[PDB]
Design an enzyme around this catalytic site. Sequence first.
Site, PDB file in Angstrom:
ATOM      1  N   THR A 157     -16.935   0.383  14.929  1.00  0.00           N
ATOM      2  CA  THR A 157     -16.428   1.608  14.323  1.00  0.00           C
ATOM      3  C   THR A 157     -14.908   1.618  14.119  1.00  0.00           C
ATOM      4  OG1 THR A 157     -18.288   2.752  15.100  1.00  0.00           O
ATOM      5  CG2 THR A 157     -16.374   4.125  14.615  1.00  0.00           C
ATOM      6  N   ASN A 178     -13.704  -2.320  19.477  1.00  0.00           N
ATOM      7  CA  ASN A 178     -13.830  -1.011  20.107  1.00  0.00           C
ATOM      8  C   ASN A 178     -13.301  -1.100  21.558  1.00  0.00           C
ATOM      9  OD1 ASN A 178     -14.807   0.529  17.847  1.00  0.00           O
ATOM     10  ND2 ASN A 178     -16.962   0.305  18.530  1.00  0.00           N
ATOM     11  N   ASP A 259     -25.235   6.746  12.977  1.00  0.00           N
ATOM     12  CA  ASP A 259     -24.973   5.795  14.052  1.00  0.00           C
ATOM     13  C   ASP A 259     -25.562   6.260  15.400  1.00  0.00           C
ATOM     14  OD1 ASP A 259     -23.123   3.410  15.108  1.00  0.00           O
ATOM     15  OD2 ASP A 259     -22.853   5.106  16.452  1.00  0.00           O
ATOM     16  N   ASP A 306     -18.795   2.969   7.678  1.00  0.00           N
ATOM     17  CA  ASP A 306     -17.953   2.013   8.380  1.00  0.00           C
ATOM     18  C   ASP A 306     -18.697   0.672   8.558  1.00  0.00           C
ATOM     19  OD1 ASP A 306     -19.673   3.138  10.329  1.00  0.00           O
ATOM     20  OD2 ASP A 306     -18.096   3.366  11.812  1.00  0.00           O
ATOM     21  N   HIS A 307     -20.016   0.716   8.769  1.00  0.00           N
ATOM     22  CA  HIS A 307     -20.876  -0.455   9.075  1.00  0.00           C
ATOM     23  C   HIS A 307     -22.335  -0.003   9.013  1.00  0.00           C
ATOM     24  CE1 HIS A 307     -21.604   1.281  12.874  1.00  0.00           C
ATOM     25  NE2 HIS A 307     -20.301   1.407  13.039  1.00  0.00           N
ATOM     26  N   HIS A 418     -24.683  -2.870  16.305  1.00  0.00           N
ATOM     27  CA  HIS A 418     -23.930  -3.444  15.191  1.00  0.00           C
ATOM     28  C   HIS A 418     -22.747  -4.154  15.809  1.00  0.00           C
ATOM     29  CE1 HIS A 418     -21.079  -0.156  15.767  1.00  0.00           C
ATOM     30  NE2 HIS A 418     -22.150   0.602  15.968  1.00  0.00           N
ATOM     31  N   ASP A 678      -3.491 -24.826   8.221  1.00  0.00           N
ATOM     32  CA  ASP A 678      -3.274 -23.560   8.930  1.00  0.00           C
ATOM     33  C   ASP A 678      -3.347 -23.756  10.453  1.00  0.00           C
ATOM     34  OD1 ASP A 678      -2.661 -20.891   9.161  1.00  0.00           O
ATOM     35  OD2 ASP A 678      -4.763 -20.229   8.863  1.00  0.00           O
ATOM     36  N   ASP A 682      -3.037 -18.158  10.853  1.00  0.00           N
ATOM     37  CA  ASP A 682      -2.597 -16.836  10.341  1.00  0.00           C
ATOM     38  C   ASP A 682      -3.179 -16.594   8.946  1.00  0.00           C
ATOM     39  OD1 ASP A 682      -0.929 -18.472   8.748  1.00  0.00           O
ATOM     40  OD2 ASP A 682       0.907 -17.436   9.310  1.00  0.00           O
ATOM     41  N   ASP A 686       0.688 -23.230   5.678  1.00  0.00           N
ATOM     42  CA  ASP A 686       1.720 -23.716   6.613  1.00  0.00           C
ATOM     43  C   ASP A 686       2.856 -24.391   5.831  1.00  0.00           C
ATOM     44  OD1 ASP A 686       0.067 -22.994   8.746  1.00  0.00           O
ATOM     45  OD2 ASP A 686      -0.347 -25.113   9.308  1.00  0.00           O
TER      46      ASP A 686
END
Length: 799
Positions: A157, A178, A259, A306-307, A418, A678, A682, A686
């Site tokens: 969430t 979360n 949810d 959200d999901h 989830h 990389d 990130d 590079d």
Amino acid sequence: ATSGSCKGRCFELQEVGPPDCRCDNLCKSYSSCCHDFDELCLKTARGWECTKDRCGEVRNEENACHCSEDCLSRGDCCTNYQVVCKGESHWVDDDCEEIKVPECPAGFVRPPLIIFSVDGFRASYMKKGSKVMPNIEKLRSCGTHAPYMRPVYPTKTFPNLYTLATGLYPESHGIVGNSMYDPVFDASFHLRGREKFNHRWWGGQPLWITATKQGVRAGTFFWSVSIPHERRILTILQWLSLPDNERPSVYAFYSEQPDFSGHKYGPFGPEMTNPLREIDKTVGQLMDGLKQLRLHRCVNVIFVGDHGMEDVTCDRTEFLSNYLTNVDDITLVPGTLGRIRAKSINNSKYDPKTIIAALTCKKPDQHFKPYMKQHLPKRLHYANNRRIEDIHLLVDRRWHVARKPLDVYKKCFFQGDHGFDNKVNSMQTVFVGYGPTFKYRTKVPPFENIELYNVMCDLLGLKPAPNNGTHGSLNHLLRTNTFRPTMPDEVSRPNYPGIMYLQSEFDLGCTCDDNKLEELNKRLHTKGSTKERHLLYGRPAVLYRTSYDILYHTDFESGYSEIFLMPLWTSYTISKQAEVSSIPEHLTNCVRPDVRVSPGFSQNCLAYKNDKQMSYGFLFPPYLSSSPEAKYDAFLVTNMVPMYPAFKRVWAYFQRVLVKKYASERNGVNVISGPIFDYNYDGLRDTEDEIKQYVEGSSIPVPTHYYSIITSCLDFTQPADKCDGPLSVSSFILPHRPDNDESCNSSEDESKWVEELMKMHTARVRDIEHLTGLDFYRKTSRSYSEILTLKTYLHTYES
Ligand SMILES: *[C@@H]1O[C@H](CO)[C@@H](O[C@@H]2O[C@H](CO)[C@@H](O[C@@H]3O[C@H](CO[C@H]4O[C@H](CO)[C@@H](O)[C@H](O[C@H]5O[C@H](CO)[C@@H](O)[C@H](O)[C@@H]5O[C@H]5O[C@H](CO)[C@@H](O)[C@H](O)[C@@H]5O)[C@@H]4O)[C@@H](O)[C@H](O[C@H]4O[C@H](CO)[C@@H](O)[C@H](O)[C@@H]4O[C@H]4O[C@H](CO)[C@@H](O)[C@H](O)[C@@H]4O)[C@@H]3O)[C@H](O)[C@H]2NC(C)=O)[C@H](O)[C@H]1NC(C)=O
Ligand SMILES: C[C@]1(O)C[C@]2(CCN2C(=O)c2cnc(N[C@@H]3Cc4ccc(Cl)cc4C3)nc2)C1
Ligand SMILES: [Ca+2]
Ligand SMILES: [Ca+2]
Ligand SMILES: [K+]
Ligand code: NA
Ligand SMILES: [Zn+2]
């Protein structure tokens, strides 16, 4: 100090600075509301609906909402007032009529935006629950909708709500789960409780701040759980009735459903019908409420989740205690993903390498896979944050991972969860846009939730903060307010070297066993005569300062880096009719100097001979040469790249079998391949001073990954090289690893595991752009917004 009063302050937008008591929509959550908050602000008397007997009543200020004559001007009518008392129709019973222009009350400077966010609303609810959600179905069919919207990983969430707010990946906004531990603060973040209210957790710039900073007023997005949904809606509608100088332009509603129920009953439990009905009824309240205020053809409404939600039960739990003897020396963040760190920083006997090995391919149907976070599929963008533990477990859909069995029965209860891989169909969620700025009765392809921040900014006339969306890629959702980006400027121009070196100037330790009609023929090839065939969409632009050369050949074109001693990119087209051939015996170990490129800017075979771990491959595959004579070009030192033997098994199968398969299935393909570096995980290209591994004894840098972009005509009755219209792409970013430990079946023939590896490492072209500082599809006949959409496409390989 809760002895102040909320009188005339109910759901105030500006949060007053304690120790003064609060009357805003979050005060309950910080246990900070004034003494009279419930009495004054959470009125319930007479419920939420006008009835025929309350019509025209004398106003009684105790009532939850009003059915008096004055309610519309006051903006506090029950949402069904005009229906019950003035013979109006519910919004849902009205025909859809195109909204060509905003139809707003005088004094509105811009159409407001209302975001109606629903927790755990799985994408397939739109079809599967359609009979019980008529208000939502009308938004969907009359507005602009996607079949589904892809959340970010982890599909929890707070990561996803804050991504919606910021346009950033969790690794960048910092809400990476979360639950989280930040080692530099030495502090923990949890759903339950209060440390999550500390502002140091939350990075980037959320929409409500973007709005405020640019002179656009925002409603408060977060609602305390105890504030009933009806009251949230009535509060929005009251705010919308404020005077021009005080009225926000952007609002959010949030529902904890479906949810909350989904966890208890599973995504499609029979108990799920009622939560979906109740959500639909709330949408209906909003729309009836807008309609009575003459705002139903003024406001843009986004219905977004959200999901999604998967079937998950107690019995489908893997226990680390079944793998590790050392289980009490680790901390696990458990559930639908795993994150592992040492229980104590003072334990020098903790070794991540030995934990990974103890968790790798140990049981035949093992329902999780361990990764060092830098080895996770790059599409997840889940590594570049100190709050993400080095060791990650990717959990199979429908499963949990836990440290010990006592964790699961000392807390069966739940049937849904989830958090899984954001490619998983059950995790997908919804998007609907309805209003003057959205298109009418339009379906758009699925897209990622990182893109919505930019659109919401477009809808409010805001300049978005720097984010991970690709601004323009969702222009096709909008009637107007599109954002018209320009292609980035090329920073480095290429050199086009001719023949400048004699064979005997090269001492690379390499060897190779190697008419006048077709002597001109090969000259023209080296000058770029076939380039229109192999470079279909123009050369990629290099967006950073570097030194590179374009090298033309019969079968392929490359942009060769003098700095990294290998191509940045190699481009080639393989027709439907192309033939696969072998590497002839005489050329098995053939590497040939490239007389266009100085020995000083070349790789050397002796380094590979010396390096007992590292071998090499080719970017343009010798297997797909157009002719025996053309095949020599494929063995140029300028086409060679460092490859671990384990990786060569992958690469060789891709090149020898899969490219031809795709060309046959898609009516030719254009392929662009190349290395990625990389080392600092990130997600960005590079610089040369970031490279941690070279081929022993040399300046040849070792890629962390290899990409390919495989493009064809969307209309596959047209050949890739003669396509009149929209394109089709699939791409991958394969990790360049010295073992195939990731693939538990890798002892088997490549036909049983390579393609499933490649699918796991599917990528967007945009992902590769970030990782390479290249910009692709510069020269097409398509609109730039269409190309941006193409660049953000992800081929998910889900059913
Ligand atoms: C997705 O979109 C986002 C947003 O566009 C992209 O993220 C950006 O990437 C840029 C390049 O990595 C990065 O630019 C750096 O910014 C530094 C200043 O940072 C602060 O200011 C900004 C602006 O207000 C703010 O947003 C930042 O917020 C981050 O940090 C806070 C913690 O304070 C978090 O709350 C927040 O969540 C966010 O964290 C994320 O980013 C940081 C990195 O900044 C990560 O470490 C976290 O894990 C997390 O991912 C900051 O508050 C600036 O100082 C940097 O400049 C240095 O770097 C280069 C050379 O390396 C050089 O040009 C400079 O001279 C300078 O070097 C000197 O300092 C070095 C570092 O200390 C030192 O080692 C050298 O020796 C030098 O002396 C740099 O410009 C930008 O901050 C982020 N923004 C955000 C919001 O994340 C992201 O790349 C996109 N992703 C993809 C895949 O495309
Ligand atoms: C203990 C708890 O208090 C924590 C729980 C689980 C989630 N939640 C919330 O409190 C909760 C309350 N409001 C919102 N509003 C959302 C935030 C947001 C972000 C972007 C967008 Cl575009 C719209 C929205 C509206 N989101 C979350 C219960
Ligand atoms: Ca959720
Ligand atoms: Ca990098
Ligand atoms: K070797
Ligand atoms: Na293996
Ligand atoms: Zn949930």
